[model samples]
Target: SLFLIESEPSTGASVSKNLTEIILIFSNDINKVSQLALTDLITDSDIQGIDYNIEGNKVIINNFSLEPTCNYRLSYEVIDIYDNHLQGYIEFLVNQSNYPQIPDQEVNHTILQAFYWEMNTGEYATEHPEEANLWNLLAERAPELAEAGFTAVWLPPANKGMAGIHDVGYGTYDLWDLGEFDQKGTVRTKYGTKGELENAIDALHNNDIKVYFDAVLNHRMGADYAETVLLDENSRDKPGQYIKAWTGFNFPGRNGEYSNFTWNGQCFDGTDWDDYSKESGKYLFDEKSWDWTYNWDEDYLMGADVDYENEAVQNDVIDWGQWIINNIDFDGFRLDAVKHIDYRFIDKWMSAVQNSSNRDVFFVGEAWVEDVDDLKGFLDTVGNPDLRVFDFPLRSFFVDMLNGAYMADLRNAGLVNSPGYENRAVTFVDNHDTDRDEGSYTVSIYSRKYQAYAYILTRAEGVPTVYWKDYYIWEMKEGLDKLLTARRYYAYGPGYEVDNNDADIYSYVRSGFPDVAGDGLVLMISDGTSGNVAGKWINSRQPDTEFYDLTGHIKEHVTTDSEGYGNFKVIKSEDKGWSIWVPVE
Candidate 1:
């Protein structure tokens, strides 16, 4: 029996929903939960050992908690951005849907990349000199991002770059800078001062948003001065090789403030600057190229490519990561260009950093390989040593879809579906790589990113990552806002592939539950023209349960039948348009 009650809704009333008990439903055979906490603020409930059951994946919670002998009901209370809250006790029922599988450690994750290409606003990596304000701006938007339902915020490379004030962070000049040194031409990078970044992190933390630091450990660039050496492109060193290539790194400014580690020909495998010829070209330092030049298909790219074979390099990288973790209080890392680095080394480094501190951090690598097999190999080799890789394969499916690839066969749209890589797949539509000018990503159907957004954010597959420009500039926050909300609440259990013609329409549903939060959602999106309609049979949980489109595209309400089957009909589809129905209600 429900005896004690606790709630804090908008109104002053004690609330009447307590008369019933809470029941939830799902599509997957779900009971495989990793963590569950039912808390009540007013009651100070001992939520650690609450009574709950798992009939398959559909979790059933008892309305009352047994304390001593009497039972007290503790409701799940969550405060929204506007201070509105949901609190209740419920007795409910659930019928069969098609699917509902809640995976282990199901995080309704919505990640924000936080920065974008061609950032002209900051003194960072820009030709023009402006205030290092990205940090402050990010801080200002912290609350908004949190309110937008982002589980993590992937920040830009916060360390010092070789270009100093002119670098956007990839040019790893100083791992310790975080705007703390005068090594670069300016005190602050394009983002902002180190203090501002700290403040930004603080702001995000205060709002309960997790921060992900960008880690660019692949290379270094813009040495303090060039040296004399042989210019060789080969991976092998035949003892005192002929052509001498001159390249090294020394931070003359600040005389090594946070780190005494300096880069020279000993630290790098190659250089883009042909110092031997006094011209701009590529170079390979002896004995180091063997570590990378022959492996990973030209692992060498921009700047002074780091020699991962060096123990000094390995130790320094690991130690630097530990420093970042200790200094920034960051939640995780978005490792830049994981495709180019020695995969094994990365596994070691991540292990060292994560294990050294005994902290729980989420890591996702950027192995941008289009081949699903090769990506799988990466996952299998590294094989989930507490680290995950981005779903580049799934992303390719999306980018290809955007560029006239149709929606007839999205069954392979997820890396998880493609080859069982769900736990390690960080899915996304677009990021700085695809958005940048004169870069590698060329397959962007920019006009229809929203549909892709709807897919990644709504589906039960990969951990979705949202781009910065899409959220702050392109005004996707309006659409993504609802999608994330639905995901947070109703987008649990098992997701079903209702219909995917692979031409222009893809329909999916998250099995909404009964008598619980995050009921469920139905999404329909298109990359084609307007005036198109999608009619699909969606398994709504309860009969006569009315659902209205949170997308505001559908005006009429839909009611489920006695069998909980409803015909979800969208009269028209707007190009790059989507219909996300709740219940983000």
Candidate 2:
């Protein structure tokens, strides 16, 4: 009857430095302890000064100290009165110090944007249909991605859209049909069937990678019925002329399988096209007004803008949110076009989904505001601390600085520098929309992309997101893999910026953990056209240590001065290059 029931400092958990005691409980009465050992795996030695006591079915182990960067294991063997033997071991680690170390150091998660805009244009599928299924493609790459140190992946929108396999999943249509019903002339979305999506999610989960679905809830397209509604040229606050708009969604293919509720003109506020009059402009319902928006004027981007003011419309969407949680096994959401929708409605929708599902569903919104204050203000209005916003302000600086602007201004670039917003910023160099190179938000400078990555990945501020196009498509995988490896192992402790007065180069250092040796790095990037060396005195926090360039740009090793400062060198390149100097162990 002797069996291990529970344990304090649970297996695989990192504990604080002040942890003094560990406890274990058994399933039966008092048993005789035969053997007990607490070993530090790193040093391959038994932890000295350890003792234990047995009280009934519980065992207490204390009178020992745990060190940082050490993997520890506690093994024991015992037998009950009937000689029923029990033996097992529990392992854990000591929490290493981190910079700004309160929150930034607390989480070391890296995100991967798993899709690009042209990922499902059907042209590639014409040649290789097997590889065109994005879900299966993602599933195949899950193991390699996990090995690359990605903790999560943000997939494209999974719902059925207007163009079916050709659409990039932004134009929303049927929420109930996730590649299940024969809607939009196809039974599957651009990515794959619902079964394939779930299988990909399972594969990712099997590798301990969290999956984030793109939630496009701003507008509806491909309606089943057309209705006459009042039109407004620009504003929704005034009376308007009547125009016939396609606002009814009957989902004939689904035939009301999961949701019997039908959407009519009462579910929306405005639309772009008019069927009867053969006209196209912004048209609104007679009495409806615009909801809360981040942009000036209104945020009616395209298609039929959903009216969150209507209770029925709100209930239907919230019900869909709940429905998706019950159906798909996803870990988070990447909210699309948040600036075009109402913040109040999103707050309600998020809470409803999280509460009903009873899961810690992560949410990151795309506000696309170049000003950090506006992004901060959006979060303030939503009033949900859990919701994070993309670091567009940082990207704004990157857009300028990396493309021949003053690199000095980047020190105050994004929400990472703003007070109380460091942990809420998801920093990225480019995304599907920005990578198009023809849009208003393009950061398509090929040479400067690695420099931007060096900034976000090396600094101890915002969480970095790697775009799929840049990593796999554009063939920047090797460089990104190096940065990712450094981020996983040495990007720790508080960061210190070095003012070198050279506008061509940006330099910073991540101070290594106080107890962990060789656990930090010094980063330097140059925007100059010619080859150059960055001889700035940046602190690596590892005194008298020899550092080698992880980027492989420079072969010479630089030894730090007595003060843990080193004059690190960057390579000379015709385009642009960066260097990350890590301790030579």
Candidate 3:
């Protein structure tokens, strides 16, 4: 059969103004160029200045004028030597600008963890019924969040958990049931119904905010039946001890809607509780071995530790990863509890899910380790450059600096400091596990919260995540808003250390790009008893330019020297002791 194999300046190609010719390749020799048409898609008008020459199996199309940012469509109909007609069209765009478009003035990619621990169980639900539905709340706040400079929003697990609306989406039960089927004592998850979730995602995307799904692939609970399994945590084939484990899961409510893959004892390596004896103990399935992991032994954290070694289990999980992306439509994944799961499975899962979707799906795993070396090792194991891990060490360093550790200590801390890991670091001040309920690892120092935020939000290294509780619940939105503005407008170029020697003050300079006007800033932090001016000179990257505090902590403007160096002041407000000195003009 005769067909057009390829086209130059191929379909959807955005080419520069210098693009001179369009070439077409066919599977067989073309007898004649029956028809050729070029249309400016922007103006919806056919172009008159196009000429083509058929050279064997190739057609060279040339002599057409192109305008900047104009979308063009080239239609062609060719008859092969066998008299078979092949007709198709290719669409492309001319570069919008004559020069390189860096877009440094635009807002950077910043993510917001949209929900906290037990978010739906708060008092706000009672005060605001419409806001009680997390999905509804997100939909309403999408525009505002976008306006506030949030590029992405990380949503909690949408799957129905074991405890349903109260489970916080962590007690994984039914992956197929995303608040759709009547199961687990409710048809809706903690957030909202399936339809509501879709609408919320659409709303966020409409506002140009990317939505990331919280994925829990470690284990599953709330089995419909029990199966006899061994309690051998050590030996793989140990069949001495037998116990009834609740490892069977058949979603009767879903009844094979999206998937019919059911789970049993063979699908899991071990379970925490026994159904027959009603005893709470670690029980491993006979002939099953645990996966290699970091942090703890066997890395079996909770109920029905999924055996990634099992082929069926691996296939089912991979299938589910694909199903969620296809059905719910997410931009990325906030992979939960990756330390407990096999790294190989994650690598495989990421490859499959990303390959299945057209959109560039981002993934950030929660390995949750204090040492950056462990994270680096895990990244080596996965070997995926795109997989980013949370900067737990940086968060810890923020806490330590706030708790009287030398502010200079921050220079030696975090994944961002580690060589070759700056881009892979996902920095944050606090999250759900660290800021909620009893025994929470909350940031004790209230005064230095903005100072910590100033570091992450304006730094050149890691991508920052804004905690929802801090922004909305704790009423720090005003402070966060200022930092967000600084980040969106002025936080550009490479950051250079300025005042790492000071015990109470730490500073850095964002070297602004030459093309971007009013870009770049100097950030200074003070934890002392009184106001302290950064003694060491710092580069503002705006030579001889007047700069003022974007945070509005310092009222006076400081003009930089001809070399873009200046002394920045941070006032001793106790509560707000950080300043972001951005170019005035």
lDDT digits (tens) for residues 131-221 of candidate 1: 2477887788778777567768898898888677767788887777788777768888878888888898899889878888899988877
Candidate 3 clashes between residue pairs 3 or more apart in a chain or in different chains: none
lDDT of each: 0.65, 0.80, 0.80
TM-score of 1: 0.76
Q: Pick the candidate with the highest TM-score.
A: 3
Clashes of 2: 3
**Of models 1 and 3, which has the larger TM-score?**
3
TM-score of each: 0.76, 0.79, 0.79
Candidate 1 residue-wise lDDT at 473? 62
Pick by lDDT: 1 or 2, better one = 2
Tens-place lDDT per residue, model 2, 283-340, is 7776677898756645688999999898988888888777766677788888998888
